[PDB]
Ligand binder design. Structure first.
Ligand code: SF4
Lengths: 85, 73
DNA sequence: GACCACAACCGATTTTCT
DNA sequence: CAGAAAATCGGTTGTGGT
C-alpha cells in the first residue's frame, strides 16, 4: 500500500530519470546505489547522474507530481527527500 | 484543493521551449495556491521549472527563458 | 582511497548576424 | 549566397572537501 501510488508518479518520468531515482533510493531491491554505479548502468559519468538526479528531484517536488502524495525504509527516505527535514 | 498543474501532463511545467513555459505560467494564474507555491519554491531554490506562475533558473526567477540559437538584436 | 558537490570546460547543433 | 558568431544542450573534466 502507498508504495504503489508513488510507483505511479515514477512512471510519469522518462526511464532514465525514474531508474536514476530508483537506484539512488534502492526502491526495487532495498540497496541504494552510488552515483558511479548508476553511471555505469546508463553509460554516463557520475556527475551527469548527479545533474539528472537534481533536476528529477526538482520535478518530483513539483505539485503536479507531489501534491497527490502528501499523505528507515527506502520509500520513507524518498518521501523525506521530497519534502523538508 | 484542485490545482491547475495537476491536470494535463506535468512536464509542461518543465517544458524545454519558452513557449511551453509561458503556457504553464499562464495556467498557474488560476491556482488557489500560487503565492505559496512561489514562496516555497524560492525557499528551496528550485533549479528549473514553473512554480507559482514563474520560471525558475538555478534558484531565481528568469521571467523569460532564452531561446536556443543566437539572440536577435 | 571511497564518495560527491561545484565550476569550468567541450563538441554538437541551432539560430542569427554580417 | 557564405561564413562567422553566439547561444543552448547533453555531457565530461578538474578541483577540492569530507
Ligand atoms: S501555482 Fe504551483 S500548484 Fe498552481 S499551477 Fe503554478 S506550480 Fe502548479
Amino acid at each position: 500500500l502507498l508504495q504503489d501510488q508513488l510507483q505511479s508518479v515514477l512512471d510519469t518520468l522518462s526511464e532514465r530519470e525514474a531508474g536514476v531515482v530508483r537506484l539512488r533510493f534502492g526502491l526495487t531491491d532495498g540497496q541504494p546505489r552510488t552515483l558511479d554505479e548508476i553511471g555505469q548502468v546508463y553509460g554516463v559519468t557520475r556527475e551527469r547522474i548527479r545533474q539528472i538526479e537534481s533536476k528529477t528531484m526538482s520535478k518530483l517536488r513539483h505539485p503536479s507530481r507531489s501534491q497527490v502524495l502528501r499523505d528507515g525504509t527506502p520509500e520513507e527516505r524518498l518521501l523525506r527527500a521530497i519534502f523538508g527535514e | 484543493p484542485v490545482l491547475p498543474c495537476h491536470v494535463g501532463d506535468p512536464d509542461l511545467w518543465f517544458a524545454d521551449t519558452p513557449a511551453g513555459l509561458e503556457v504553464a505560467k499562464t495556467l498557474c494564474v488560476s491556482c488557489p495556491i500560487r503565492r505559496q507555491c512561489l514562496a516555497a519554491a524560492l525557499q528551496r531554490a528550485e533549479p528549473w521549472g514553473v512554480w507559482g506562475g514563474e520560471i525558475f533558473d538555478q534558484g531565481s526567477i528568469v521571467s523569460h527563458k532564452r531561446p536556443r540559437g543566437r539572440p536577435r538584436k
